[PDB]
Design an enzyme around this catalytic site. Structure first.
Site, short mmCIF file in Angstrom:
data_model
loop_
_atom_site.label_atom_id
_atom_site.label_comp_id
_atom_site.label_asym_id
_atom_site.label_seq_id
_atom_site.Cartn_x
_atom_site.Cartn_y
_atom_site.Cartn_z
N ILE A 115 0.76 -1.12 0.05
CA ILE A 115 -0.14 0.01 0.04
C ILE A 115 0.63 1.44 0.03
O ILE A 115 2.08 1.15 -0.12
CB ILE A 115 -0.81 0.18 1.29
CG1 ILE A 115 -0.24 -0.32 2.52
CG2 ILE A 115 -2.19 -0.84 1.06
CD1 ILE A 115 -1.16 -0.33 3.62
N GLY A 138 7.83 2.23 3.31
CA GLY A 138 8.26 2.02 2.08
C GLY A 138 7.55 0.32 1.79
O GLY A 138 6.63 0.17 1.19
N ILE A 157 5.45 -1.91 3.24
CA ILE A 157 4.47 -1.99 3.92
C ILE A 157 3.44 -2.76 3.10
O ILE A 157 3.03 -2.19 2.01
CB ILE A 157 3.76 -0.90 4.43
CG1 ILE A 157 4.96 0.13 5.19
CG2 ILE A 157 2.63 -0.85 5.32
CD1 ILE A 157 4.47 1.37 5.86
N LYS A 209 4.67 -4.34 8.28
CA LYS A 209 5.89 -3.36 7.96
C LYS A 209 7.18 -4.61 8.03
O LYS A 209 7.13 -5.28 8.96
CB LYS A 209 6.17 -2.26 8.78
N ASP A 251 9.05 14.19 15.92
CA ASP A 251 8.67 14.48 14.59
C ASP A 251 7.22 14.64 14.31
O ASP A 251 6.63 14.06 13.33
CB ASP A 251 9.30 13.43 13.49
CG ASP A 251 9.74 14.00 12.21
OD1 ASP A 251 9.50 15.19 11.96
OD2 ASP A 251 10.30 12.93 11.36
C1 LIG Z 1 3.40 5.72 8.68
C2 LIG Z 1 3.28 6.30 7.15
C3 LIG Z 1 4.42 5.93 6.19
C4 LIG Z 1 1.79 5.50 6.57
C5 LIG Z 1 1.97 4.74 5.65
N1 LIG Z 1 0.86 4.09 4.90
C6 LIG Z 1 -0.30 3.67 5.76
N2 LIG Z 1 0.09 3.08 7.05
C7 LIG Z 1 -0.88 2.77 7.69
N3 LIG Z 1 -0.64 2.13 9.18
C8 LIG Z 1 0.59 2.33 9.80
C9 LIG Z 1 1.86 2.46 9.11
C10 LIG Z 1 2.97 2.37 9.77
F1 LIG Z 1 4.15 2.80 9.20
C11 LIG Z 1 2.95 2.63 11.31
O1 LIG Z 1 3.91 2.54 11.78
C12 LIG Z 1 1.72 2.46 11.76
F2 LIG Z 1 1.70 2.07 13.37
C13 LIG Z 1 0.61 2.25 11.21
N4 LIG Z 1 -2.07 2.50 7.21
C14 LIG Z 1 -2.37 2.68 6.19
C15 LIG Z 1 -1.50 3.46 5.29
N5 LIG Z 1 -1.93 3.87 3.59
C16 LIG Z 1 -3.26 3.83 3.62
C17 LIG Z 1 -0.82 4.29 2.90
O2 LIG Z 1 -1.27 4.73 2.16
C18 LIG Z 1 0.62 4.15 3.68
C19 LIG Z 1 1.21 2.92 2.75
#
Ligand SMILES: CC(C)CCN1c2nc(Nc3cc(F)c(O)c(F)c3)ncc2N(C)C(=O)[C@@H]1C
EC number: 2.7.11.1
Length: 317
Positions: free
Chosen positions: A24, A25, A27, A47, A153
């Site tokens: 959906i 780096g 992940i 992740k 941050d």
């Molecule tokens: C962290 C940024 C880069 C968000 C990245 N991210 C998403 N992350 C999560 N949950 C998430 C991601 C994480 F890294 C976490 O540490 C965490 F606790 C929860 N859900 C949905 C998305 N959605 C829709 C995206 O479009 C992108 C890939």
């Protein structure tokens, strides 16, 4: 396709089974193990990073120490909160692939980030949105600070909405989070040799600019710069981001005279009173001082009363 074979079942350290989906780096979408394939509506994310990745280990330690589902629930009950914006940790493990070692972590899946919504609304959030966001961020900060960590941050791209509830915001990314008070012993006012990161230049604290380890006041100051950026679309030092000396010089001078920051940020006379009062309160904090979070929330609540509103928890996004 690397890291995982899509649809494969992975088992974490607590022997809980999960199934891997599309990215959906690195992940991917993930769900509990079952006969169904992982879809786009997945409630979890996985992740994955090489085992020697420092930020994922740091992040994992934060989650294991401070974001256990029950630990968050006990806080929500005792403080009488509607929710807490600290993402839930579901499990972690080790995964080997093509002779290489990887670490994985299962987390809550979220919706859009605030940076996208902010940009789609012509780089503005209303006073109602800013105040409602900041009250929820103050809840998160108090909780992580009470669990010996600082974030360092805070920014709109690090704030994610609940996938099913647009009035719940979560603070993510603890890869560069810092354990400021291990075992109740506050770190000294000096550089941490292990710590290399200085935050996001436009929002980072004066402490981080001075090359010292981040502390609680720094998180509160970062939130202060976020609030101004959200309300106005700008920060005074925005066109000089390449030079950190310049950014630090401006923040230092503006901290000395908050009325001048208000005049620069809000050119047409009046600025919202709670912002100046919040900045003035944060300014009084010593490096190792415990903030009075309830007084900071009270300053923001007066902002809601001034606009004929109350903390109804509505983000209005
Ligand atoms: C962290 C940024 C880069 C968000 C990245 N991210 C998403 N992350 C999560 N949950 C998430 C991601 C994480 F890294 C976490 O540490 C965490 F606790 C929860 N859900 C949905 C998305 N959605 C829709 C995206 O479009 C992108 C890939």
């Amino acid at each position: 396709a690397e890291q995982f074979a899509v649809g494969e079942i992975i088992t974490d350290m607590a022997a809980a089974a999960w199934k891997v989906g599309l990215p959906i780096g690195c992940i991917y979408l993930a769900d509990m193990n079952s006969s169904e394939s992982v879809g786009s509506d997945a409630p979890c994310v996985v992740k994955v990073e090489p085992s020697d990745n420092g930020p994922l280990f740091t992040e994992l330690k934060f989650y294991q120490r401070a974001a256990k589902p029950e630990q968050i629930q006990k806080w929500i009950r005792t403080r009488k909160l509607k929710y807490l914006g600290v993402p839930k940790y579901w499990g972690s493990g080790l995964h080997d692939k093509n002779g290489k070692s990887y670490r994985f972590m299962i987390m809550d899946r979220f919706g859009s980030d605030l940076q996208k919504i902010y940009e789609a609304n012509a780089k503005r959030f209303s006073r109602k949105t800013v105040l409602q966001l900041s009250l929820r961020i103050l809840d998160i900060l108090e909780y992580i600070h009470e669990h010996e960590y600082v974030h360092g941050d805070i920014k709109a791209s690090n704030l994610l909405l609940n996938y099913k509830n647009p009035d719940q915001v979560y603070l993510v990314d603890y890869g560069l989070a810092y354990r400021y008070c291990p075992e109740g012993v506050h770190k000294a006012y000096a550089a941490d040799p292990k710590r290399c990161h200085d935050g996001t230049i436009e929002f980072t604290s004066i402490d981080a600019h001075n090359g010292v380890a981040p502390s609680r006041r720094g998180d509160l100051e970062i939130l202060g710069y976020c609030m101004i950026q959200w309300l106005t679309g700008h920060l005074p030092w925005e066109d000089n981001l390449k030079d950190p000396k310049y950014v630090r010089d401006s923040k230092i001078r503006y901290r000395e005279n908050i009325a001048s920051l208000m005049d620069k940020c809000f050119p047409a006379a009046n600025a919202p009173g709670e912002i100046a009062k919040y900045m003035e309160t944060v300014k009084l904090l010593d490096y190792t001082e415990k903030p009075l979070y309830e007084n900071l929330r009270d300053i923001l609540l007066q902002g809601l009363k001034a606009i004929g509103s109350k903390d109804d928890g509505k983000l209005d996004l």
